[PDB]
């Protein structure tokens, strides 16, 4: 009844891109939604790292000393694109610092260390099941989880389930209030998403996001919570893929899809 009250030209956008775009956006005030390929599976890529940090925060509700626990690691832990953790190789970092780095810089070594702490891909999947997400699956470690093979359900979710879970974790009751605000603050501090959903969001609105970029099959994504002033927040997810391994991803297409979603919800921006 409240889904796609206003049609938007997502099909033309994905056709110009040369692939598939999946969008699910929720107006948390009215419950109205914009939905396009929203129940199709798309590779998570590094977007799993946001949910990983939420899982760490959930564990910290039962383990008061978890976030400040110091974690030391060897050079063998430093995998490509570890911009924060490489600066602390000789010192270690706390669990909270690793979580912030995984969210805000997409730090690979940090994410691997935290994934191990949680019991691996199955442990993160179990956390997502515990909040009612039956779609999400993480199956592999980095960097193998970025393969983005057409038709492969490993390491995928849907735009809808990503949005639904993001809403539960940032605005709902899945985390206790201090942990919820910490998750929001990490998302707000993200540095890797300026050309994605954020590029569709006016500068005077608050926003947090987590990106993912697989590097193959035109596969990249972003999810965000957006606080337009004077109305309820919007939660949305934009995921892309394309048929050929060497197809390029596009940040501009993600931003454009986010703009269409806000327009479809009647959010003036």
> Where exactly are the structural domains of the chain?
10-264
From CA 253, how far away is CA 11, in angstroms rounded? 12
Active-site entry in 30, 39, 130, 144: 144
From CA 107, how far away is CA 86, in angstroms rounded? 9
106 annotated ligand binder: yes
Superfamily classification of domain 10-264: DD-peptidase/beta-lactamase superfamily (3.40.710.10)
From CA 158, how far away is CA 164, in angstroms rounded? 10
Contact 263, 5 (CB under 8 A): no
170 annotated ligand binder: no
**114: how many CB neighbours lie within 10 A of its CB?**
22
Residue (of 19, 18, 17, 23) closest to 36 by Cα position: 23
**Two tokens at 257?**
């899809």
Residue (of 118, 110, 111, 154) closest to 136 by Cα position: 154
Residue 3, CA atoms < 13 Å, CB-side half-sphere:
7
Residue 177, CA atoms < 13 Å, CB-side half-sphere:
0
213 annotated ligand binder: yes
From CA 110, how far away is CA 222, in angstroms rounded? 20
What 8-state DSSP symbol labels residue 141?
-
268 annotated ligand binder: no
From CA 61, how far away is CA 130, in angstroms rounded? 14
Annotated catalytic residue 158 = no
Residue (of 44, 25, 5) closest to 236 by Cα position: 25
| Strand order through the sheet with 33-36 | 33-36, 20-27, 234-241, 220-227, 206-213
Active-site entry in 14, 20, 35, 46: 46
Residue 69, CA atoms < 13 Å, CB-side half-sphere:
15
From CA 134, how far away is CA 109, in angstroms rounded? 27
Annotated catalytic residue 30 = no
The reported resolution of this PDB entry, expressed in Å, is 1.0
């Amino acid at each position: 009844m409240l889904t796609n009250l206003v049609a938007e030209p997502f099909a033309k956008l994905e056709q110009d891109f040369g692939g598939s775009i999946g969008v699910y956006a929720m107006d948390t005030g009215s419950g109205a939604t914009v939905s396009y390929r929203a129940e199709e599976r798309f590779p998570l890529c590094s977007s799993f790292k946001g949910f990983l940090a939420a899982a760490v925060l959930a564990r910290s509700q039962q383990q008061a000393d978890l976030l400040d626990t110091p974690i030391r690691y060897g050079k063998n832990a430093l995998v490509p694109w570890s911009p924060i953790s490489e600066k602390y190789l000789t010192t270690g970092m706390t669990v909270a610092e690793l979580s912030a780095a995984a969210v805000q810089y997409s730090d690979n070594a940090a994410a691997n260390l935290l994934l191990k702490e949680l019991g691996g891909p199955a442990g993160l999947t179990a956390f997502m099941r515990s909040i009612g997400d039956t779609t999400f699956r993480l199956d592999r470690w980095q960097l193998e989880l970025n393969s983005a093979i057409p038709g492969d359900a490993r390491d995928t979710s849907s735009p809808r389930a990503v949005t639904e879970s993001l809403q539960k974790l940032t605005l709902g009751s899945a985390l206790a209030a201090p942990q919820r605000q910490q998750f929001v603050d990490w998302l707000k501090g993200n540095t890797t998403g300026n050309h994605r959903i954020r590029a569709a969001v006016p500068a005077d609105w608050a926003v947090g996001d987590k990106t993912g970029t697989c590097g193959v099959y035109g596969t990249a994504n972003d999810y965000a919570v957006v606080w337009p002033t004077g109305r309820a927040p919007i939660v949305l997810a934009v995921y892309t893929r394309a048929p050929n391994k060497d197809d390029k991803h596009s940040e501009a297409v993600i931003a454009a899809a986010a703009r269409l979603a806000l327009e479809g919800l009647g959010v003036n921006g």
